[PDB]
Amino acid sequence: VLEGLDAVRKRPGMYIGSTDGAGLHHLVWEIVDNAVDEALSGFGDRIDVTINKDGSLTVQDHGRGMPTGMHAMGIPTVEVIFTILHAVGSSVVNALSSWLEVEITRDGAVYKQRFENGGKPVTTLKKIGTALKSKTGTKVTFMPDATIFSTTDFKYNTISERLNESAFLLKNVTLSLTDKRTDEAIEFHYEN
Amino acid sequence: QVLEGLDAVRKRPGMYIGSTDGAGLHHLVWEIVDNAVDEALSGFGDRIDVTINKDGSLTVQDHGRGMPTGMHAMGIPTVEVIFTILHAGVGSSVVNALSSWLEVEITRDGAVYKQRFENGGKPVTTLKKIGTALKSKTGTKVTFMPDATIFSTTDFKYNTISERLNESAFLLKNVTLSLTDKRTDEAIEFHYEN
Ligand SMILES: CCNC(=O)Nc1cc(-c2nc(C(F)(F)F)cs2)c(-c2cc(-c3n[nH]c(=O)o3)cnc2N2[C@@H]3CC[C@H]2CN(C)C3)cn1
Ligand SMILES: CCNC(=O)Nc1cc(-c2nc(C(F)(F)F)cs2)c(-c2cc(-c3n[nH]c(=O)o3)cnc2N2[C@@H]3CC[C@H]2CN(C)C3)cn1
């Protein structure tokens, strides 16, 4: 049985544990786990996480990029991933975000869709530019909903140690963290 | 070669950048880009990113070796000498003189350095280490706001800057020059091959 995003908003703790500092960072693990699941599948050798000045957060990998095709009713596949809950991580974050943007680069084209106010699409998946055929990947940027979380301040140390673990488990893949609020940055990379 | 302060440039701006209208305004852009192109041309860095920020300021970022972070006489940073002393390697100080503020950011050895100038190139901080970076990352980022009390117009033209970077890519070859307009969220790249 499928559910909408309002189902996650209704009982947020049931999907991310809680709505405090810990739960806020669960949002980060969800998106990153998808980039890591791409690397593990053999695509992309780096995953860059960026904490922006506006308080939002960005995860960018260099994998194959999420599918750019359509489904039923001319609804993009990426829209199905972010708005239909198969109750899975991508839609949960979108549901608990005041806005979210997904940027896909594949086949020499760059696509983009934006969501707002708990994952309501405000644009479709649009082709907005071109790129080299060698450049591929997915960029997700989201702003955690302040009317749901008790805190929307991402912790540099917390995200830091977790990327260190994920780097250690993956091997051969560099995960980075860049904080544009404080001009700090750090990388993790393990090899065997 | 008698050396001068920046007040000499503010006094006669047209003598250093041609004019104080739209044309002269964009000369400021060419000066900073020419330093990035001159670093690229020396074999360091393969891309040069220009950004028109929302605040009206302009940013040029290359990925070269980064300007010297060392000191000269009196504990004065070398980058400060480049931007505040006119040798009337002259373009950087001219731009600074005709800016209400300007920032220089150097990235080397995994560290990020930064100095800021204000009111016609008067230093308001020294060169301080402000953050960290990757050991693989190197380069110079210059961001400035053209002084409105000198220029009759301070609105950078997207079309104008676009065309010039297109030429530069063509003369250079093997170097990618980009332009990003955050006012309108448009962007374009150029790269030529031989
Ligand atoms: C910053 C976050 N970035 C990303 O999450 N990028 C990303 C996402 C995916 C996918 N994620 C999903 C979904 F979220 F689980 F629904 C479906 S496809 C995929 C993905 C693509 C393909 C695929 N592209 N072209 C093709 O023929 O097959 C296949 N699987 C993908 N997934 C699956 C398994 C690894 C990756 C993420 N997994 C959670 C789901 C790749 N990259
Ligand atoms: C967005 C604007 N970007 C830049 O301005 N990047 C930049 C600037 C420089 C320099 N520029 C100058 C100056 F402005 F001409 F005074 C002095 S050093 C240099 C530069 C560095 C070095 C150097 N670094 N470490 C070392 O041992 O020697 C040497 N030359 C540099 N210059 C000279 C010649 C090529 C390049 C730019 N030229 C304008 C000045 C490199 N990149």
Short mmCIF file of C-alpha atoms and ligand atoms in Angstrom, two decimals:
data_model
loop_
_atom_site.label_atom_id
_atom_site.label_comp_id
_atom_site.label_asym_id
_atom_site.label_seq_id
_atom_site.Cartn_x
_atom_site.Cartn_y
_atom_site.Cartn_z
CA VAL A 1 0.00 0.00 0.00
CA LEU A 2 1.36 3.40 -1.08
CA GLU A 3 1.17 6.66 0.92
CA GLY A 4 1.61 10.39 0.30
CA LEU A 5 4.02 12.78 2.01
CA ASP A 6 1.39 14.13 4.41
CA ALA A 7 1.51 10.69 6.05
CA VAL A 8 5.13 11.31 7.03
CA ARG A 9 4.37 14.84 8.20
CA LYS A 10 1.49 13.56 10.33
CA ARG A 11 3.74 11.24 12.35
CA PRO A 12 7.35 12.33 11.67
CA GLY A 13 8.89 10.41 14.57
CA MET A 14 7.67 7.12 13.15
CA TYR A 15 9.87 7.61 10.07
CA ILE A 16 12.98 9.38 11.44
CA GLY A 17 12.92 8.51 15.15
CA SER A 18 12.41 12.03 16.49
CA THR A 19 12.20 15.73 15.58
CA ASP A 20 15.10 17.08 17.61
CA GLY A 21 18.83 17.33 16.83
CA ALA A 22 19.19 13.61 16.20
CA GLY A 23 16.20 13.43 13.87
CA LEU A 24 17.43 16.46 11.95
CA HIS A 25 20.62 14.62 11.08
CA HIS A 26 18.70 11.49 10.05
CA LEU A 27 17.68 13.58 7.04
CA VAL A 28 21.36 13.85 6.15
CA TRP A 29 21.96 10.09 6.45
CA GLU A 30 19.02 9.27 4.16
CA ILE A 31 20.27 11.24 1.15
CA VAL A 32 23.91 10.26 1.71
CA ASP A 33 22.98 6.57 2.00
CA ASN A 34 21.66 6.79 -1.56
CA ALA A 35 24.88 8.27 -2.87
CA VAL A 36 26.77 5.59 -0.95
CA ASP A 37 24.53 2.91 -2.41
CA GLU A 38 25.57 4.25 -5.82
CA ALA A 39 29.28 4.10 -5.10
CA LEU A 40 28.88 0.58 -3.73
CA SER A 41 27.23 -0.28 -7.04
CA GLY A 42 30.35 1.03 -8.76
CA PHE A 43 29.41 4.56 -9.81
CA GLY A 44 31.06 7.69 -8.47
CA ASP A 45 34.28 7.91 -6.50
CA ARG A 46 33.42 10.94 -4.36
CA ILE A 47 30.43 12.20 -2.40
CA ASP A 48 30.54 15.85 -1.36
CA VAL A 49 28.28 17.15 1.42
CA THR A 50 27.91 20.90 1.77
CA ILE A 51 26.34 22.86 4.63
CA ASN A 52 25.30 26.15 3.01
CA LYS A 53 25.16 29.66 4.48
CA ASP A 54 21.36 29.76 4.22
CA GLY A 55 21.25 26.73 6.53
CA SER A 56 20.28 24.25 3.81
CA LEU A 57 22.29 21.11 3.05
CA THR A 58 23.64 19.62 -0.18
CA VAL A 59 24.75 16.11 -1.11
CA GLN A 60 26.36 15.60 -4.51
CA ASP A 61 27.58 12.30 -5.96
CA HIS A 62 29.01 11.42 -9.37
CA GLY A 63 27.00 8.31 -10.16
CA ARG A 64 24.70 7.54 -13.06
CA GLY A 65 22.16 10.10 -11.90
CA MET A 66 18.56 9.27 -10.96
CA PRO A 67 16.32 8.25 -13.90
CA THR A 68 15.09 11.09 -16.12
CA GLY A 69 12.19 9.23 -17.72
CA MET A 70 8.44 9.60 -17.26
CA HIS A 71 5.85 7.31 -15.67
CA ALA A 72 2.06 7.50 -15.86
CA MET A 73 0.24 10.82 -16.48
CA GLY A 74 3.46 12.44 -17.68
CA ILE A 75 4.80 12.29 -14.13
CA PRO A 76 8.62 12.10 -13.96
CA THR A 77 10.22 9.05 -12.31
CA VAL A 78 12.11 11.33 -9.93
CA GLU A 79 8.78 12.84 -8.84
CA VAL A 80 7.57 9.34 -7.93
CA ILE A 81 10.70 8.72 -5.88
CA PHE A 82 10.33 11.95 -3.86
CA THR A 83 6.54 12.10 -3.39
CA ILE A 84 5.30 8.53 -3.19
CA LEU A 85 6.03 6.64 0.00
CA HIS A 86 6.25 2.86 -0.42
CA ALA A 87 5.25 2.29 3.22
CA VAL A 88 12.00 5.05 0.92
CA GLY A 89 14.39 7.66 2.32
CA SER A 90 14.19 10.26 -0.44
CA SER A 91 10.49 11.09 0.00
CA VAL A 92 10.78 11.20 3.79
CA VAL A 93 13.33 14.01 3.59
CA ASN A 94 11.23 15.85 1.00
CA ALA A 95 8.17 15.50 3.24
CA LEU A 96 10.02 17.09 6.16
CA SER A 97 11.61 19.88 4.11
CA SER A 98 10.31 23.41 3.57
CA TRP A 99 11.92 23.07 0.13
CA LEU A 100 14.07 20.61 -1.85
CA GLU A 101 15.83 20.65 -5.21
CA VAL A 102 17.07 17.66 -7.19
CA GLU A 103 19.55 18.17 -10.02
CA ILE A 104 20.39 15.32 -12.38
CA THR A 105 23.19 15.28 -14.93
CA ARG A 106 23.20 12.58 -17.60
CA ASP A 107 23.36 12.09 -21.38
CA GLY A 108 24.88 15.54 -21.80
CA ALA A 109 21.84 17.24 -20.32
CA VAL A 110 21.14 18.68 -16.87
CA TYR A 111 17.66 18.27 -15.34
CA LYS A 112 16.14 19.92 -12.27
CA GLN A 113 12.99 19.74 -10.16
CA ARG A 114 12.11 21.82 -7.11
CA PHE A 115 9.70 20.95 -4.28
CA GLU A 116 8.28 23.24 -1.59
CA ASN A 117 6.21 23.16 1.60
CA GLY A 118 6.53 19.48 2.51
CA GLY A 119 7.30 18.06 -0.92
CA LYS A 120 4.69 19.68 -3.15
CA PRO A 121 6.10 19.95 -6.68
CA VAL A 122 6.33 23.58 -7.85
CA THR A 123 8.03 22.70 -11.14
CA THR A 124 8.23 19.51 -13.20
CA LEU A 125 11.52 17.83 -14.07
CA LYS A 126 12.95 20.35 -16.52
CA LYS A 127 15.95 20.22 -18.81
CA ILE A 128 17.82 23.39 -17.88
CA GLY A 129 21.26 22.96 -19.43
CA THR A 130 23.93 20.86 -21.09
CA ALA A 131 27.09 19.07 -19.92
CA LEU A 132 29.73 16.63 -21.14
CA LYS A 133 28.59 13.03 -21.54
CA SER A 134 31.30 12.08 -19.06
CA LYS A 135 29.80 14.29 -16.37
CA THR A 136 27.10 12.38 -14.49
CA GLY A 137 25.48 12.52 -11.05
CA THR A 138 22.73 13.58 -8.66
CA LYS A 139 22.64 16.72 -6.52
CA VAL A 140 20.04 16.99 -3.75
CA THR A 141 19.61 20.17 -1.74
CA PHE A 142 17.00 20.46 0.97
CA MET A 143 15.97 22.84 3.73
CA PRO A 144 14.64 21.10 6.87
CA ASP A 145 11.18 22.30 7.95
CA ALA A 146 11.51 24.65 10.92
CA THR A 147 7.85 24.16 11.93
CA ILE A 148 8.56 20.45 12.42
CA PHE A 149 12.07 20.28 13.89
CA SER A 150 13.02 21.85 17.23
CA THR A 151 16.36 22.70 15.63
CA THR A 152 17.45 23.20 12.00
CA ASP A 153 21.11 23.88 12.75
CA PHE A 154 23.25 21.17 11.14
CA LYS A 155 26.21 20.07 13.27
CA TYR A 156 29.64 20.03 11.58
CA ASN A 157 31.16 17.49 14.00
CA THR A 158 28.17 15.13 13.88
CA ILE A 159 28.07 14.92 10.07
CA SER A 160 31.87 14.76 10.13
CA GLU A 161 32.29 11.52 12.13
CA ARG A 162 29.46 9.80 10.24
CA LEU A 163 31.06 10.50 6.84
CA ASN A 164 34.26 9.13 8.34
CA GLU A 165 32.51 5.81 9.10
CA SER A 166 30.79 5.62 5.72
CA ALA A 167 34.14 6.27 4.09
CA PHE A 168 35.73 3.47 6.13
CA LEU A 169 33.03 0.94 5.24
CA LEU A 170 32.96 1.84 1.53
CA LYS A 171 36.71 2.01 0.80
CA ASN A 172 38.22 3.61 -2.34
CA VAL A 173 35.67 6.45 -2.10
CA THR A 174 36.21 9.98 -0.80
CA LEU A 175 33.45 11.61 1.24
CA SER A 176 33.88 15.31 1.99
CA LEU A 177 32.19 17.86 4.24
CA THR A 178 32.24 21.59 3.54
CA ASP A 179 30.72 24.20 5.89
CA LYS A 180 30.18 27.53 4.13
CA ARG A 181 29.05 29.03 7.44
CA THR A 182 32.50 28.75 9.04
CA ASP A 183 34.79 28.22 6.03
CA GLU A 184 35.87 24.77 7.23
CA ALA A 185 36.16 21.55 5.22
CA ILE A 186 37.33 17.97 5.75
CA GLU A 187 37.73 14.73 3.78
CA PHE A 188 37.70 11.04 4.66
CA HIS A 189 39.17 8.24 2.59
CA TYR A 190 40.24 4.68 3.40
CA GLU A 191 42.04 2.20 1.22
CA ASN A 192 42.20 -1.54 0.93
CA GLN B 1 59.80 54.13 -11.34
CA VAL B 2 58.23 56.33 -8.64
CA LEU B 3 55.63 54.38 -6.63
CA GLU B 4 52.16 55.73 -5.84
CA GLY B 5 49.24 55.13 -3.50
CA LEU B 6 45.71 54.32 -4.67
CA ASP B 7 44.49 57.90 -4.29
CA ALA B 8 46.29 58.67 -7.53
CA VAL B 9 44.00 56.25 -9.35
CA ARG B 10 40.79 57.53 -7.77
CA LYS B 11 41.82 61.07 -8.73
CA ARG B 12 41.99 60.25 -12.47
CA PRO B 13 40.06 56.98 -13.06
CA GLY B 14 39.73 57.40 -16.84
CA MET B 15 43.50 57.48 -17.22
CA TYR B 16 43.72 53.92 -15.87
CA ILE B 17 40.53 52.29 -17.18
CA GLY B 18 39.53 54.49 -20.12
CA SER B 19 36.25 55.83 -18.77
CA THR B 20 33.80 55.78 -15.88
CA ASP B 21 30.73 54.51 -17.73
CA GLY B 22 29.62 51.02 -18.75
CA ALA B 23 32.75 50.46 -20.83
CA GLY B 24 35.17 51.39 -18.05
CA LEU B 25 33.17 49.35 -15.56
CA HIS B 26 33.73 46.15 -17.51
CA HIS B 27 37.45 46.88 -17.87
CA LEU B 28 37.62 46.07 -14.16
CA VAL B 29 36.45 42.56 -15.02
CA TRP B 30 39.05 42.10 -17.78
CA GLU B 31 41.88 43.13 -15.46
CA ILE B 32 41.20 40.43 -12.84
CA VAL B 33 40.40 37.81 -15.47
CA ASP B 34 43.68 38.66 -17.26
CA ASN B 35 45.56 37.68 -14.11
CA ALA B 36 43.79 34.33 -13.98
CA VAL B 37 44.42 33.81 -17.68
CA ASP B 38 48.06 34.73 -17.12
CA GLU B 39 48.29 32.05 -14.44
CA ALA B 40 46.52 29.48 -16.59
CA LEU B 41 48.80 30.39 -19.49
CA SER B 42 51.79 29.67 -17.22
CA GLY B 43 50.60 26.09 -16.80
CA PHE B 44 48.58 26.28 -13.59
CA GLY B 45 44.81 25.80 -13.57
CA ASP B 46 42.51 24.73 -16.40
CA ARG B 47 39.32 26.61 -15.45
CA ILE B 48 38.39 30.18 -14.52
CA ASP B 49 34.97 30.86 -13.00
CA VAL B 50 33.40 34.33 -13.05
CA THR B 51 30.32 34.96 -10.92
CA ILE B 52 27.96 37.93 -10.85
CA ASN B 53 26.62 37.85 -7.30
CA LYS B 54 23.16 39.02 -6.21
CA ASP B 55 24.62 41.93 -4.26
CA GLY B 56 25.97 43.39 -7.49
CA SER B 57 29.56 42.50 -6.67
CA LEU B 58 31.67 40.38 -9.01
CA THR B 59 33.80 37.29 -8.37
CA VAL B 60 36.68 35.80 -10.37
CA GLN B 61 38.05 32.45 -9.25
CA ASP B 62 40.93 30.49 -10.79
CA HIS B 63 42.60 27.27 -9.68
CA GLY B 64 46.22 28.29 -10.01
CA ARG B 65 48.98 28.28 -7.42
CA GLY B 66 47.35 31.14 -5.51
CA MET B 67 48.90 34.57 -4.93
CA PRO B 68 51.85 34.72 -2.49
CA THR B 69 50.79 34.37 1.13
CA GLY B 70 54.18 35.40 2.51
CA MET B 71 55.26 38.71 4.03
CA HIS B 72 57.43 41.52 2.68
CA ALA B 73 58.81 44.42 4.71
CA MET B 74 57.25 45.48 8.03
CA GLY B 75 55.12 42.34 8.30
CA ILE B 76 53.08 43.54 5.33
CA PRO B 77 51.63 40.68 3.24
CA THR B 78 52.77 40.41 -0.39
CA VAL B 79 49.17 40.35 -1.56
CA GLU B 80 48.68 43.70 0.18
CA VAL B 81 51.53 45.20 -1.85
CA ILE B 82 49.97 43.90 -5.05
CA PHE B 83 46.60 45.55 -4.34
CA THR B 84 47.59 48.86 -2.74
CA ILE B 85 50.79 50.02 -4.47
CA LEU B 86 50.59 51.44 -7.99
CA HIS B 87 53.75 50.89 -10.05
CA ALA B 88 53.05 53.93 -12.25
CA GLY B 89 51.38 43.73 -13.00
CA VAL B 90 49.36 46.89 -12.36
CA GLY B 91 45.78 45.76 -12.94
CA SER B 92 45.01 44.37 -9.48
CA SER B 93 45.66 47.65 -7.65
CA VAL B 94 43.65 49.66 -10.20
CA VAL B 95 40.55 47.53 -9.65
CA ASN B 96 40.95 47.83 -5.88
CA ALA B 97 41.25 51.61 -6.04
CA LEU B 98 37.93 51.91 -7.87
CA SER B 99 36.03 49.52 -5.57
CA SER B 100 33.99 50.40 -2.49
CA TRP B 101 35.26 47.04 -1.17
CA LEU B 102 37.34 44.08 -2.39
CA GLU B 103 38.22 40.64 -1.02
CA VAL B 104 41.13 38.38 -1.88
CA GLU B 105 40.95 34.71 -0.94
CA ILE B 106 43.94 32.41 -1.33
CA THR B 107 43.78 28.63 -0.97
CA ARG B 108 46.99 26.62 -0.50
CA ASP B 109 48.32 23.64 1.46
CA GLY B 110 44.81 22.93 2.71
CA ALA B 111 44.45 26.38 4.23
CA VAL B 112 42.31 29.35 3.23
CA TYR B 113 43.66 32.87 3.52
CA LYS B 114 41.72 36.10 3.13
CA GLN B 115 42.28 39.85 3.11
CA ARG B 116 39.63 42.55 2.75
CA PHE B 117 39.93 46.15 1.52
CA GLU B 118 37.39 48.99 1.67
CA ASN B 119 36.76 52.55 0.45
CA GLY B 120 39.09 52.70 -2.54
CA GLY B 121 41.45 49.92 -1.54
CA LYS B 122 42.15 50.81 2.08
CA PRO B 123 42.99 47.59 3.94
CA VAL B 124 40.53 46.86 6.75
CA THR B 125 42.12 43.55 7.73
CA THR B 126 45.55 42.05 7.24
CA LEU B 127 46.01 38.67 5.57
CA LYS B 128 44.55 36.21 8.08
CA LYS B 129 44.01 32.45 7.96
CA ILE B 130 40.22 32.08 8.23
CA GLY B 131 39.57 28.43 7.45
CA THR B 132 40.64 25.05 6.15
CA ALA B 133 40.50 23.33 2.79
CA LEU B 134 41.61 20.22 0.94
CA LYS B 135 45.32 19.60 0.23
CA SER B 136 44.46 19.12 -3.46
CA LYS B 137 42.73 22.50 -3.67
CA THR B 138 44.66 25.60 -4.75
CA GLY B 139 43.65 28.96 -6.22
CA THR B 140 42.82 32.65 -5.97
CA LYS B 141 39.36 34.14 -5.53
CA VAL B 142 38.92 37.90 -5.96
CA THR B 143 35.56 39.53 -5.22
CA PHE B 144 34.91 43.25 -5.56
CA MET B 145 32.13 45.85 -5.56
CA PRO B 146 32.72 48.71 -8.00
CA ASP B 147 32.60 52.15 -6.35
CA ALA B 148 29.33 53.90 -7.24
CA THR B 149 30.84 57.31 -6.44
CA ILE B 150 33.22 56.80 -9.36
CA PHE B 151 31.22 54.90 -11.97
CA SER B 152 28.06 56.30 -13.55
CA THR B 153 26.77 52.71 -13.66
CA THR B 154 27.60 49.64 -11.57
CA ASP B 155 25.33 47.09 -13.27
CA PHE B 156 27.45 44.35 -14.86
CA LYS B 157 26.10 43.22 -18.23
CA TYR B 158 25.67 39.47 -18.65
CA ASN B 159 25.86 39.65 -22.47
CA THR B 160 29.01 41.76 -22.44
CA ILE B 161 30.98 39.57 -19.98
CA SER B 162 29.73 36.46 -21.77
CA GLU B 163 31.14 37.45 -25.16
CA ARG B 164 34.57 38.40 -23.79
CA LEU B 165 35.03 35.10 -21.93
CA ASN B 166 34.03 33.32 -25.15
CA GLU B 167 36.90 35.03 -27.00
CA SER B 168 39.39 34.33 -24.24
CA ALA B 169 38.57 30.64 -24.28
CA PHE B 170 39.18 30.64 -28.03
CA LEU B 171 42.58 32.32 -27.85
CA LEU B 172 43.70 30.25 -24.86
CA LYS B 173 42.47 26.77 -25.82
CA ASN B 174 42.37 23.90 -23.30
CA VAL B 175 41.00 26.26 -20.62
CA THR B 176 37.37 26.39 -19.50
CA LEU B 177 35.93 29.85 -18.76
CA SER B 178 32.50 30.07 -17.13
CA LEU B 179 30.03 32.85 -16.33
CA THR B 180 27.31 32.64 -13.69
CA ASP B 181 24.62 35.27 -13.12
CA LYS B 182 23.02 34.75 -9.70
CA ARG B 183 20.65 37.65 -10.30
CA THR B 184 18.84 35.70 -13.00
CA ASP B 185 20.14 32.20 -12.30
CA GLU B 186 21.72 31.76 -15.76
CA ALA B 187 25.16 30.34 -16.58
CA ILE B 188 27.38 29.43 -19.54
CA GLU B 189 30.71 27.70 -20.23
CA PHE B 190 33.29 27.94 -23.02
CA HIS B 191 36.10 25.55 -23.93
CA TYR B 192 38.12 25.21 -27.12
CA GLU B 193 40.43 22.38 -28.22
CA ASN B 194 43.70 22.12 -30.16
C1 LIG C 1 22.63 12.70 -3.56
C2 LIG C 1 21.70 11.50 -3.74
N1 LIG C 1 21.93 10.91 -5.06
C3 LIG C 1 21.35 9.76 -5.44
O1 LIG C 1 20.59 9.17 -4.68
N2 LIG C 1 21.63 9.33 -6.68
C4 LIG C 1 21.13 8.19 -7.19
C5 LIG C 1 19.88 7.63 -6.94
C6 LIG C 1 19.47 6.43 -7.54
C7 LIG C 1 18.25 5.97 -7.25
N3 LIG C 1 17.64 6.09 -6.07
C8 LIG C 1 16.40 5.57 -6.08
C9 LIG C 1 15.51 5.56 -4.84
F1 LIG C 1 15.71 6.73 -4.14
F2 LIG C 1 15.82 4.51 -4.08
F3 LIG C 1 14.23 5.48 -5.24
C10 LIG C 1 15.97 5.07 -7.24
S1 LIG C 1 17.21 5.28 -8.31
C11 LIG C 1 20.34 5.82 -8.46
C12 LIG C 1 20.16 4.62 -9.16
C13 LIG C 1 20.24 4.66 -10.55
C14 LIG C 1 20.08 3.50 -11.30
C15 LIG C 1 20.16 3.50 -12.63
N4 LIG C 1 20.50 4.54 -13.39
N5 LIG C 1 20.51 4.12 -14.67
C16 LIG C 1 20.21 2.83 -14.64
O2 LIG C 1 20.13 2.11 -15.64
O3 LIG C 1 20.01 2.41 -13.39
C17 LIG C 1 19.91 2.29 -10.64
N6 LIG C 1 19.86 2.27 -9.24
C18 LIG C 1 19.98 3.39 -8.52
N7 LIG C 1 19.95 3.22 -7.20
C19 LIG C 1 19.26 2.15 -6.49
C20 LIG C 1 20.47 1.28 -6.19
C21 LIG C 1 21.66 2.28 -6.06
C22 LIG C 1 21.01 3.63 -6.24
C23 LIG C 1 20.46 4.12 -4.92
N8 LIG C 1 19.72 3.04 -4.26
C24 LIG C 1 19.17 3.50 -2.98
C25 LIG C 1 18.66 2.61 -5.17
C26 LIG C 1 21.55 6.41 -8.69
N9 LIG C 1 21.93 7.59 -8.06
C1 LIG C 2 41.27 35.76 -9.89
C2 LIG C 2 42.63 36.44 -10.03
N1 LIG C 2 43.65 35.40 -9.90
C3 LIG C 2 44.96 35.67 -9.80
O1 LIG C 2 45.35 36.84 -9.83
N2 LIG C 2 45.74 34.58 -9.67
C4 LIG C 2 47.08 34.57 -9.61
C5 LIG C 2 47.91 35.69 -9.44
C6 LIG C 2 49.30 35.58 -9.42
C7 LIG C 2 50.01 36.71 -9.24
N3 LIG C 2 49.67 37.93 -9.69
C8 LIG C 2 50.53 38.91 -9.34
C9 LIG C 2 50.35 40.39 -9.75
F1 LIG C 2 49.05 40.75 -9.62
F2 LIG C 2 50.73 40.53 -11.05
F3 LIG C 2 51.10 41.19 -8.96
C10 LIG C 2 51.56 38.52 -8.59
S1 LIG C 2 51.38 36.89 -8.38
C11 LIG C 2 49.86 34.30 -9.56
C12 LIG C 2 51.21 33.99 -9.60
C13 LIG C 2 51.76 33.14 -8.64
C14 LIG C 2 53.11 32.83 -8.68
C15 LIG C 2 53.67 32.01 -7.79
N4 LIG C 2 53.01 31.28 -6.90
N5 LIG C 2 53.93 30.56 -6.22
C16 LIG C 2 55.12 30.86 -6.73
O2 LIG C 2 56.18 30.39 -6.35
O3 LIG C 2 54.99 31.76 -7.72
C17 LIG C 2 53.90 33.34 -9.70
N6 LIG C 2 53.34 34.17 -10.66
C18 LIG C 2 52.03 34.50 -10.62
N7 LIG C 2 51.59 35.28 -11.60
C19 LIG C 2 52.34 36.39 -12.20
C20 LIG C 2 52.64 35.77 -13.56
C21 LIG C 2 51.49 34.75 -13.80
C22 LIG C 2 50.57 34.97 -12.62
C23 LIG C 2 49.65 36.15 -12.90
N8 LIG C 2 50.42 37.30 -13.38
C24 LIG C 2 49.54 38.47 -13.55
C25 LIG C 2 51.47 37.61 -12.41
C26 LIG C 2 49.01 33.22 -9.74
N9 LIG C 2 47.63 33.37 -9.77
#
